[PDB]
């Protein structure tokens, strides 16, 4: 299981400015490419993408720019469907890509668009039909159905998308086909004479997916637990922690469990 994803953002800066256009490319949890309309061409975020020729950089840059022009026209159309003013700043997001299974063969494809934080239209799991969120989206769906664009999107997601994911997985194997098992440890913080907080720490792991669960005398605990969002360290690894409020003098009764792809057997942490 591996994935390739593009996250695209288009912000209509009004009156003074052309829109802003961003596209970020990800293999699993590793950024490998960036396109930015306001950058002083393509800037490689990964060494193995730089191994690709200058033709790759110029083609993708042309594609990005064509997409920019398409988003710009879409932003204007969206402004019109909803009868909004050209003086407003609006946001148009896109996220697409493909997943592969253990055989590096096509498993899933997805292509979703959001307008101003709200799901606008998305390709179905079958990559055959579309899902609209309101009447404007219904117009897009009818336009897109009339043009048969779900065919091209499926083609790309089952074809080009998978082929290039495989190529990057082989070419950047040392960065992408690796796992860094989490280094764990436990902190303690008194709340009062008879309540305390245990915090279970996971540091420097990769991929980002992890499961941190607390146990009281071996039983699962979700009451009085807090689980923060996984965060990047900057060095290509991730951090995460989970906390539980315990009675003072019962800290030893609680254990933390860490499940991770780099762990054949889950880790157990005691205080």
């Amino acid at each position: 299981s591996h994935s390739m994803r593009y996250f695209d953002t288009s912000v209509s800066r009004p009156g003074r400015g052309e829109p802003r256009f961003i596209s970020v490319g990800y293999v699993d949890d590793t950024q490998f490419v960036r396109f930015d309309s306001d950058a002083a061409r393509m800037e490689p975020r990964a060494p193995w993408i730089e191994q690709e020729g200058p033709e790759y950089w110029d083609r993708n840059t042309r594609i990005f720019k064509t997409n920019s022009q398409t988003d710009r026209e879409s932003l204007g159309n969206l402004r019109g469907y909803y009868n909004q003013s050209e003086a407003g700043s609006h946001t148009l997001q896109s996220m697409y890509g493909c997943d592969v299974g253990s055989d590096w063969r096509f498993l899933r494809g997805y292509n979703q668009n959001a307008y101003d934080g709200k799901d606008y239209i998305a390709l179905k799991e079958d990559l055959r039909s579309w899902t609209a969120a309101d009447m404007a989206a219904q117009i897009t769906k009818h336009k897109w159905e009339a043009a048969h664009v779900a065919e091209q999107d499926r083609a790309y997601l089952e074809g080009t998308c998978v082929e290039w994911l495989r190529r990057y997985l082989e070419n950047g194997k040392e960065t992408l086909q690796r796992t860094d098992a989490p280094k764990t440890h436990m902190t303690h913080h008194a709340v009062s004479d008879h309540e305390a907080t245990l915090r279970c720490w996971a540091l420097s792991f990769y991929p980002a997916e992890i499961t941190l669960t607390w146990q009281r005398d071996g039983e699962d605990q979700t009451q009085d637990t807090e689980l923060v969002e996984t965060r990047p360290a900057g060095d290509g690894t991730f951090q995460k922690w989970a906390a539980v409020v315990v009675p003072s003098g019962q800290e030893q009764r609680y254990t933390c469990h860490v499940q991770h792809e780099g762990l054949p057997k889950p880790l157990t942490l005691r205080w």
């Binding site: 596209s23 396109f35 997409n67 988003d71 026209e73 896109s94 897009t140 997601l157």
Partner: peptide, 9 residues
């Protein structure tokens, strides 16, 4: 490798 979007919303 980017996909090319050919159709306006």
């Amino acid at each position: 490798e980017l996909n090319r979007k050919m159709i306006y919303m």
